[PDB]
Design a protein around this ligand. Structure first.
Ligand code: OV5
Length: 278
């Protein structure tokens, strides 16, 4: 049922590529008449023991998450393990905003914000920290529906602790990380809230490259990690997006509070986003 036969997974193309893994577009087609469903299939390529263990955790995490705003686990395929997910043909939200900017207004962006928030609220209820919340990792289900994706760096909190310390820092872009993550490798639901603030910045700049998080931080900026951390600890933040409502920018600034304790929860952000302009 949730076991997918290798021989019926017809490869079409690559969707994304990583250093130790890749995501491929396939049609699972048992009948062989091209009528079967399209699926996104993740697999490791020449990985080490550490990456295989993480991949086993990722599979079980995603398998247990049930939300309308999180990409759906479909099953597995077995020498080498493969993770089968639903396929969302509209692609990631970053490319979508850039491509369809003229068609999408501020109310649509707030709809996406609300749905991402609800997904993250649900993730926090499962004691799960995403660690890589960004517009590139949000998928478009339809023009009025987005889902959080890419659980490769996701980790569950310890049962009796609200934070997690990463030993070996995974090389993802520094401009979505909270201060404590950069300084001390501390991750939590509150560090995800920081990243959500950057997602709101991404949405309301329509993921424009010229004014991206990196581009704008680099303008404000001896090492790059040490300079970014120095800048944030002085209180310097990303600017208001030009086409952003005042109240939305105020919520971004609360998401970026220096102390994790002073940042609002996704449960407190949700109603604030939904009640805007009513
Ligand atoms: C014609 C151009 N087509 C696309 O540009 C396209 C279409 C669909 C697409 N979908 C993705 C993409 C990813 C993905 C990745 F491949 C690398 C890094 C991060 C993510 Cl979220 N993951 C999943 C999916 C999916 O449907 N289910 C899981 N991605 C790209």
């Amino acid at each position: 049922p949730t076991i997918f036969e290798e021989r019926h997974l017809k490869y079409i193309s690559q969707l994304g590529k990583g250093n130790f893994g890749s995501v491929e577009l396939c049609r699972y087609d048992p009948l062989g008449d091209n009528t079967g469903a399209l699926v996104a299939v993740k697999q490791l390529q020449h990985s080490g023991p550490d990456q295989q263990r993480d991949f086993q955790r990722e599979i079980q995490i995603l398998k247990a998450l049930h939300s309308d705003f999180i990409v759906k686990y479909r099953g597995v395929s077995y020498q080498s393990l493969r993770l089968v997910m639903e396929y969302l043909p509209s692609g990631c939200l970053r490319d979508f905003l850039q491509r369809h900017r003229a068609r999408l207004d501020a109310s649509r962006l707030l709809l996406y914000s609300s749905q991402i928030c609800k997904g993250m609220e649900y993730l926090g209820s499962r004691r799960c920290v995403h660690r890589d919340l960004a517009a590139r990792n949000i998928l478009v289900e339809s023009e009025a529906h987005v889902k959080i994706a890419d659980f490769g760096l996701a980790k569950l909190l310890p049962l009796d602790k609200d934070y997690y310390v990463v030993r070996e820092p995974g090389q993802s872009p520094i401009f979505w990380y909270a201060p404590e993550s950069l300084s001390d490798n501390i991750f939590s639901r509150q560090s995800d809230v920081w990243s959500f603030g950057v997602v709101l910045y991404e949405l309301f700049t329509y993921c424009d490259k010229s004014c991206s998080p990196s581009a704008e931080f680099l303008r404000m900026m001896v090492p790059a990690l040490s300079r970014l951390l120095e800048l944030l600890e002085e209180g310097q933040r990303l600017p208001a997006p030009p086409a952003c409502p005042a109240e939305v920018h105020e919520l971004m600034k609360l998401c970026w509070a220096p102390s994790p304790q002073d940042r609002p929860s996704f449960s407190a952000l949700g109603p604030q986003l939904d009640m805007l302009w009513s």
